[PDB]
Amino acid sequence: RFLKVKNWETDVVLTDTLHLKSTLETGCTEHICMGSIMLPVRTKDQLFPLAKEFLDQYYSSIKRFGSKAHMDRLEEVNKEIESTSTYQLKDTELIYGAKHAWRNASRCVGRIQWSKLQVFDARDCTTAHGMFNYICNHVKYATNKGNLRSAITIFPQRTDGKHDFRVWNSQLIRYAGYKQPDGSTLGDPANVQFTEICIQQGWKAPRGRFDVLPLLLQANGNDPELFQIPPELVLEVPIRHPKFDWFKDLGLKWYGLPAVSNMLLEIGGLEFSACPFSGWYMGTEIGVRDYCDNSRYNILEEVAKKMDLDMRKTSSLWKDQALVEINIAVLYSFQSDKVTIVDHHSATESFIKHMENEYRCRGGCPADWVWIVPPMSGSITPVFHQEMLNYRLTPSFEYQPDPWNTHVW
Amino acid sequence: RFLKVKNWETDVVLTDTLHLKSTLETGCTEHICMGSIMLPVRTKDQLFPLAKEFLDQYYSSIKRFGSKAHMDRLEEVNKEIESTSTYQLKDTELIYGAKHAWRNASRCVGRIQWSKLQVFDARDCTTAHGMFNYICNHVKYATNKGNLRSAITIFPQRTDGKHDFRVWNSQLIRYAGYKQPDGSTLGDPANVQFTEICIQQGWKAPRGRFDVLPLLLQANGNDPELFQIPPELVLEVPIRHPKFDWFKDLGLKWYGLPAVSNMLLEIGGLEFSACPFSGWYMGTEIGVRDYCDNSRYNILEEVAKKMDLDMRKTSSLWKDQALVEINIAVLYSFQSDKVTIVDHHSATESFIKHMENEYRCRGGCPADWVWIVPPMSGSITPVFHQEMLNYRLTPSFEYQPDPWNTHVWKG
Ligand code: HEM
Ligand code: HEM
Numbered sequence: 070r071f072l073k074v075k076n077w078e079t080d081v082v083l084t085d086t087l088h089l090k091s092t093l094e095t096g097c098t099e100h101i102c103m104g105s106i107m108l109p110v111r112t113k114d115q116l117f118p119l120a121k122e123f124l125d126q127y128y129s130s131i132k133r134f135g136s137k138a139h140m141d142r143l144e145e146v147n148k149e150i151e152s153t154s155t156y157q158l159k160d161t162e163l164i165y166g167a168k169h170a171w172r173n174a175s176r177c178v179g180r181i182q183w184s185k186l187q188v189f190d191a192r193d194c195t196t197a198h199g200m201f202n203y204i205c206n207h208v209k210y211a212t213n214k215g216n217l218r219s220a221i222t223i224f225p226q227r228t229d230g231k232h233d234f235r236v237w238n239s240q241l242i243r244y245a246g247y248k249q250p251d252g253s254t255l256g257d258p259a260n261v262q263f264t265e266i267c268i269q270q271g272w273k274a275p276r277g278r279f280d281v282l283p284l285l286l287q288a289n290g291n292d293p294e295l296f297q298i299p300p301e302l303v304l305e306v307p308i309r310h311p312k313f314d315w316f317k318d319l320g321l322k323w324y325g326l327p328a329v330s331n332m333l334l335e336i337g338g339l340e341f342s343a344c345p346f347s348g349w350y351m352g353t354e355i356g357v358r359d360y361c362d363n364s365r366y367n368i369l370e371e372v373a374k375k376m377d378l379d380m381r382k383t384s385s386l387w388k389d390q391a392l393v394e395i396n397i398a399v400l401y402s403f404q405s406d407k408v409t410i411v412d413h414h415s416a417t418e419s420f421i422k423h424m425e426n427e428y429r430c431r432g433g434c435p436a437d438w439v440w441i442v443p444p445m446s447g448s449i450t451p452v453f454h455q456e457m458l459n460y461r462l463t464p465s466f467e468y469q470p471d472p473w474n475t476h477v478w
Numbered sequence: 479r480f481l482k483v484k485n486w487e488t489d490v491v492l493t494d495t496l497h498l499k500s501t502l503e504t505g506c507t508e509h510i511c512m513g514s515i516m517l518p519v520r521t522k523d524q525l526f527p528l529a530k531e532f533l534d535q536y537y538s539s540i541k542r543f544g545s546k547a548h549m550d551r552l553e554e555v556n557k558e559i560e561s562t563s564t565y566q567l568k569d570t571e572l573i574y575g576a577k578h579a580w581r582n583a584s585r586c587v588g589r590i591q592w593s594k595l596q597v598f599d600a601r602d603c604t605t606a607h608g609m610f611n612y613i614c615n616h617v618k619y620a621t622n623k624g625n626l627r628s629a630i631t632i633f634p635q636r637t638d639g640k641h642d643f644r645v646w647n648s649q650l651i652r653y654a655g656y657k658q659p660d661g662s663t664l665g666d667p668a669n670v671q672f673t674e675i676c677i678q679q680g681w682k683a684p685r686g687r688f689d690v691l692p693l694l695l696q697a698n699g700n701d702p703e704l705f706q707i708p709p710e711l712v713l714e715v716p717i718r719h720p721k722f723d724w725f726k727d728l729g730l731k732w733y734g735l736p737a738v739s740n741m742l743l744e745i746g747g748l749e750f751s752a753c754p755f756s757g758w759y760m761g762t763e764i765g766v767r768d769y770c771d772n773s774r775y776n777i778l779e780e781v782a783k784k785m786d787l788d789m790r791k792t793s794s795l796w797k798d799q800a801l802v803e804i805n806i807a808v809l810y811s812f813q814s815d816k817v818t819i820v821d822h823h824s825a826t827e828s829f830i831k832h833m834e835n836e837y838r839c840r841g842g843c844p845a846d847w848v849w850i851v852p853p854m855s856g857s858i859t860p861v862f863h864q865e866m867l868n869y870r871l872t873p874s875f876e877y878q879p880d881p882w883n884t885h886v887w888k889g
C-alpha cells in the first residue's frame with residue numbers, strides 16, 4: 070500500500086505515498102484497466118466535508134494546521150454553508166486552489182511550472198461584454214509580445230446550474246472549419262460543428278483556411294454572444310523550414326497561445342465552469358497532432374510530395390521522415406519569431422525532474438503515461454521508460470458537457 | 479454488462495462483452511491505475527475448477543459442449559487429479575491452449591496471426607541435451623531460410639516446483655554484453671549479467687560486439703548446461719542504408735529470429751515453465767529499441783555525427799532525424815536479404831483489423847495501449863487513436879522470476 074515506481078533506463082526507484090490521499094475514482098477495477106479511455110448540482114450535504122478537506126490542506130501548506138485561525142476559518146465556512154447553501158473562497162485560497170489544480174493535472178507534462186501561475190480573479194463579472202474584457206486582458210498578459218506567461222482567469226462559481234458562466238469555445242484561439250460542396254474540408258475539421266454554431270448564431274465567416282474564430286460567451290445562463298478578439302492581440306507564426314525554401318508556399322501558420330477554455334475547475338467542493346487557462350506550446354502539439362492527424366489538417370501527403378519521397382510503400386517510412394521535418398520547422402519558426410515554445414525532448418526531461426521533486430517534497434506525483442509520452446519519438450524521451458501511477462487528487466480540472474447540448478435556448 | 483470503446487480518428491464504436499470472462503486481476507483499483515507498471519506450488523484444491531473451465535472452453539470451441547466426449551474427459555481429468563494430484567493434456571488441448579495464450583496476450587500487436595502457430599510437443603524430453611536438440615529443430619523450422627514461420631516448443635510441465643524445466647536465456651538468440659574495467663560496455667548492455675553467468679559456467683567468450691550467446695538449459699530441476707547453437711542455424715542480416723553508403727561501415731548486424739524463452743505458459747491450471755516461442759520482427763524493435771535506447775547499443779550519436787546534423791541544440795531534432803534513418807536501414811536490409819519483417823505502419827493497421835474482427839466474432843480483444851503503440855511516430859499509426867480495454871484471460875503467458883535467483887545448486 071506504499072507503492073514503488075521504477076525508471077527502467079536509470080534504475081531510479083521512487084516510493085509513492087501521496088496516492089493514499091486520493092479520493093475520486095479512476096474508472097479502473099481489479100478486473101479491467103481503462104487506462105486508455107479518453108473520458109471515463111451539489112446539495113448542502115456533500116459540501117462541508119469537501120470544504121473541510123480543502124481548508125485542512127491549505128492551512129497545512131502554510132504551517133497553520135491546528136491553529137486558531139484554522140479553526141476559525143473552518144467555523145466561519147461551516148456557518149456560511151449552513152446559512153447560504155454555499156460559500157466564498159478568500160483570494161489566498163483561490164490562488165492556492167488554482168495552482169494546485171494544475172499541480173494535480175495527471176495528463177499535463179508541463180507541471181514543473183505549476184507554482185508560477187498568474188491568477189486573475191473575475192468573480193465580480195456579470196455580463197458577456199465584461200467576460201470579453203477579462204478575456205482580452207488575459208490574452209494580452211499571457212502573450213506578452215511572445216514571451217509567454219502562464220495565466221488563468223476565474224469567472225463566478227456555479228450556483229443552481231441555471232446561472233452558469235461558460236465559454237463556448239474549446240480554446241480561446243482556434244481556426245474555423247467548413248465542409249465544402251466539393252465534399253472536402255476547408256480549415257480545421259475539428260471545429261466544423263462549432264463554426265456552424267457561430268454562423269447559425271450570427272457570425273459572418275471569411276471562409277478561409279486559417280480564420281481565427283470569434284468568442285462565444287455565456288454569462289449567468291443567458292444566450293451566448295459573439296465577440297471578435299482584436300487581431301493585434303492574436304500572435305501568429307508563419308511556418309518556414311530552415312532548409313526547404315519551398316515550405317513557405319504551403320501557406321501554413323499557427324497561433325502562439327494555447328488557451329483551454331472549456332474545462333471545469335473544482336476547489337473545495339465549489340465549481341468554476343468558466344476558467345480559461347493558458348501556457349505555451351510543446352512543439353509536437355502543433356506539428357504532430359494539429360498538422361498531421363488524419364482528422365485534422367492532414368498535410369503529410371502534400372509535404373512528402375514536395376520532398377519527392379517514395380510514397381509507394383509504407384516501409385520506406387516516408388511519413389516518418391516528413392513528420393520530423395514538419396516538426397523541425399514549427400520549432401524553427403517560433404524560435405525565429407521569438408515566441409516561447411518547448412521541444413518534446415526538453416519538456417519531458419523537465420517532467421522527470423519535476424517528478425523527482427514531487428516525490429521528494431510531496432511523496433508523489435499523479436501521472437498518466439498514455440498522455441505524458443509525446444506522439445512522436447516516444448522511446449527516445451525519458452518519460453517512456455518511467456513507470457507512473459495515475460490517481461485523482463483535488464483541487465482539479467474536469468471535463469464538462471458542451472454547452473449547446475445543455476443550454477435551454 | 480457491456481462496455482464501449484471508441485476510435486477517435488474514425489468514430490467507430492465497439493462493444494466489449496468478453497471482459498465478463500476475465501478472472502486474473504490487473505493491478506488497478508478504483509483509486510489507482512497501474513497501467514504503466516511493467517510487472518505485477520499448486521494443490522489439488524484450486525486445480526480442478528481451473529481444469530474444468532479450460533475444458534469447457536475447449537469443448538465449446540469444437541462445438542461439442544456437454545457431449546459425452548466432454549463429460550467423459552471431465553470425469554477422466556477429475557479422477558487423474560484426485561489420484562495423481564495433476565493431469566496430462568491431450569495433444570489437441572495443448573495446441574488449442576498454446577494458440578489461445580497468444581490470442582490472449584494483450585501486449586502483442588502481432589496477434590492477427592494467432593491461429594497459424596506451429597506447436598512442437600516436447601513433453602517427452604528428459605535431459606538438457608534433449609532440450610538442445612528440440613530447440614535446434616525449432617530454430618531451423620522457424621527460420622525457414624528467411625521465410626519465417628511462427629512456432630512454439632513446449633517442454634514438460636511443473637510438478638512440485640523442484641523439478642522445473644527452464645531455458646535460462648531470455649531469448650534463444652541474443653548478443654553478449656561485456657563490462658570493461660573503464661566502465662564502458664562492449665556488445666549489448668542488456669545482456670551483461672547473463673553473459674557473466676555463461677562465462678562463469680565455462681563459456682569461452684570471443685569478446686566482440688556481436689557474439690551470439692550459448693544456450694543455458696535446465697532439465698528436471700538439475701543444474702543448467704551450456705550448448706552452442708550451430709552457426710549455420712543463426713540467420714543474421716548486415717545492416718546497410720539505401721542512400722547512405724557510410725552506414726555499412728558502422729559494422730552493424732542483427733539476427734533474424736525473435737524467440738522469447740523466459741515466459742511461463744499457463745493452460746487449465748498447468749504450468750509450462752519452458753516454452754520458447756518465435757515469430758518475426760517489427761522493424762522498430764530493432765531500429766528504435768535495440769539500437770537507440772540509451773541503455774542498449776545507443777548509436778544515435780555516431781549516426782547523427784556521420785549525417786552531420788546540428789547536434790548542439792536538442793530542438794534541432796537531430797535525434798528524431800537519425801532515428802528515422804536507422805529504422806529505414808533495418809527494414810531495407812531485411813527486405814533486401816529476403817528475411818521476413820514488418821514495418822510499424824503495416825503492423826498496427828493489421829492489428830486494428832484483427833481487433834475489430836475479434837469484437838464481432840469473440841465479443842472483445844484485450845489490449846494494452848502502452849505496449850501496442852509503437853515507440854516511434856505514435857500518433858500517425860491508427861492504434862494511437864484507438865481506445866483499448868486491458869484484462870486477463872486464460873490460457874496465458876506470464877512472467878516468472880529469473881532462474882538464477884531461485885535455483886538450488888547441486889554442484
Ligand atoms: C506552461 C506550459 C505548458 C505546457 C508545455 C503544457 C503541456 C501540456 C500538454 C502537451 C498536454 C497534453 C494535452 C493534449 O495533448 O491535448 C497538457 C494537458 C493538460 N494541461 Fe498542460 N501545459 C502547460 C501549462 C498548463 C497550465 C498553465 C495549465 C492549467 C493552469 C495546464 C493544465 C493542463 C490540463 C488540465 C491538461 C489535461 C486536460 C485533459 O485531460 O485533456 N497546463 N498540457
Ligand atoms: C508473428 C509475428 C509477431 C510480431 C510481429 C510480434 C510483435 C510483438 C511486439 C512488438 C511485442 C512488444 C514486445 C517488446 O516491445 O519487447 C510483442 C509482445 C508479445 N508477444 Fe508478439 N509478436 C509476434 C508473434 C508472437 C508469437 C508467435 C507469440 C506467442 C506464441 C507472441 C506472444 C507475445 C507475448 C506473450 C508478448 C508479451 C510481451 C511481454 O509482456 O513481455 N507474439 N509482440
Ligand SMILES: CNCC#Cc1cc(F)cc(CCc2cc(C)cc(N)n2)c1
Nearest residue numbers: 107327328329346347348349350351354
Ligand atoms: C477530447 N479532449 C480534447 C482536449 C483537450 C485538451 C485539454 C487541455 F487541458 C489541454 C489541451 C492541450 C492544450 C494546451 C493547453 C495549455 C494550457 C498548454 C499547452 N501546451 N497545451 C488539450
Ligand SMILES: CNCC#Cc1cc(F)cc(CCc2cc(C)cc(N)n2)c1
Nearest residue numbers: 648736737738755756757758759760763
Ligand atoms: C522482463 N521482460 C522480458 C521479456 C520479454 C519479451 C516477451 C515477449 F513475449 C516478447 C518480447 C518481444 C520479442 C518478440 C517476440 C516475438 C515472438 C515476436 C516479436 N516480433 N518480438 C519480449
Ligand SMILES: C[C@H](O)[C@H](O)[C@H]1CNc2nc(N)[nH]c(=O)c2N1
Nearest residue numbers: 105106107439440862863864865
Ligand atoms: C485513445 C487514446 O486514449 C487517445 O488517442 C489519446 C492517446 N494519448 C493522447 N495523449 C495526448 N497528449 N493527447 C491526446 O489527445 C491523446 N489521445
Ligand SMILES: C[C@H](O)[C@H](O)[C@H]1CNc2nc(N)[nH]c(=O)c2N1
Nearest residue numbers: 453454455456514515516848849
Ligand atoms: C514504463 C513503461 O511501462 C515501459 O517503459 C514500457 C512502455 N511501453 C513498452 N512497449 C513495448 N512494446 N515494449 C516495452 O518494453 C515497453 N516499455
Ligand SMILES: [Zn+2]
Nearest residue numbers: 097102506511
Ligand atoms: Zn488501470
